[PDB]
Amino acid sequence: ERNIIADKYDEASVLFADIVRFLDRLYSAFDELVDQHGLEKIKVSGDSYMVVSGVPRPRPDHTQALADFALDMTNVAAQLKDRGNPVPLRVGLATGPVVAGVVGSRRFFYDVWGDAVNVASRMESTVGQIQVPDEVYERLKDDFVLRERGHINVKGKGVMRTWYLIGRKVAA
Amino acid sequence: RNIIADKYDEASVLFADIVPALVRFLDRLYSAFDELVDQHGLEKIKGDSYMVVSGVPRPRPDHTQALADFALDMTNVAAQLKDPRNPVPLRVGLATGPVVAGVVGSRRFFYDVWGDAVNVASRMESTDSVGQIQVPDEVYERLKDDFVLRERGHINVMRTWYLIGRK
Ligand SMILES: [Cl-]
Ligand SMILES: [Mg+2]
């Protein structure tokens, strides 16, 4: 069985960046630059930021293009002060032959199926509110405070009395 | 195939929903939920919504109660944070009952890039001086007519330059 589909790109330029609510606004600004410059962000294991030029779409000006992007990048991080201090950004750029393409793996995660899953995920509307059916109310009433919402729609199921979960009771 | 599952006579389930980067905000939020799930000893269930189970895989007689405590902390954590515009419209549902639950393995595909240029660009950033763009000779040679670059020094073996700007 084959798990890689990849090609040699003889001509390619690679960029890594890193810092040594604000950070997300910055990375959002970088994300916007990638798209503006027509480049490719690569998802990497870590906190580092990887951008690639000349791949998957070759271009003869791959190094210059990545260079312009990197300059705009540092420019963006310069303008954005945080504590009021500038962002300590490292940027590295290299150029040379690479291999690139798609790799097959498997994602493992927990899942659940049953009426309870449906009921929990298909109750209509509310905000900041926690809504629960009778079977949950009966289990929580002695140690928590709830107030009846009333009869609502659970899509795929029907109409259902529900309660808003307000808070815990202080132990008596 | 691709599922290992078991019948659970009783379990409690939580579903939370929220109705361009912002992508990163919702990720940071789900990252805070993730930390909470671990704090409470619960399990996450896996696009624009978040699900949690209690009683799976580890049995506990207080599964609904533990989910409820988690859920109140969930709403409080969301209430603190705010998106970069508005408060976060978080709606939560809980239920309890018999379920089937376990691990799903789903084929995932990644677009990756390997080779010396990757290794070298990584070295260039890690050893970078803060505020600068560091590049080796091979980059220097391709940029030198159009960009200004000042030599920094040699790194362990290899010369590097600082990219300053266009001419
Ligand atoms: Cl070039
Ligand atoms: Mg199981």
Residue numbers in the entry:
A (entry chain B): 239 to 258, 274 to 335, 337 to 380, 383 to 428
B (entry chain A): 240 to 258, 269 to 270, 272 to 296, 299 to 337, 339 to 409, 415 to 425
Task: Copy the relevant paper text.
Rv1625c is one of 16 adenylyl cyclases encoded in the genome of Mycobacterium tuberculosis. Adenylyl cyclases convert ATP to cyclic AMP, and these enzymes are classified into six types based on their sequence similarity. In solution Rv1625c exists predominantly as a monomer, with a small amount of dimer. It has been shown previously that the monomer is active and the dimeric fraction is inactive.
Surprisingly, this dimeric fraction also crystallized as a domain-swapped dimer that was similar to the swapped dimer formed by the monomeric fraction. Clear electron density is observed for residues 240–428 of chain A (except for the β1–α2, β2–β3, α3–β4 and β7–β8 loops) and for residues 240–425 of chain B (except for the β1–α2, α3–β4 and α4–β6 loops). Comparison of forms 1 and 2 of Rv1625c-Wt shows that they form similar structures with small differences. When the protomers of each form are superimposed, it was observed that the other protomers are related by a rotation of 19°. Because of this rotation, the α2 helices of the domains come closer in form 2, precluding the space to accommodate a sulfate ion present in form 1. The possible explanation for the observed inactivity of the dimeric fraction is that it exists as a domain-swapped dimer in solution and cannot convert to the active dimeric state owing to strong interactions in the swapped form. The geometry of the active site is lost in the head-to-head arrangement of the domain-swapped dimer, rendering it inactive.
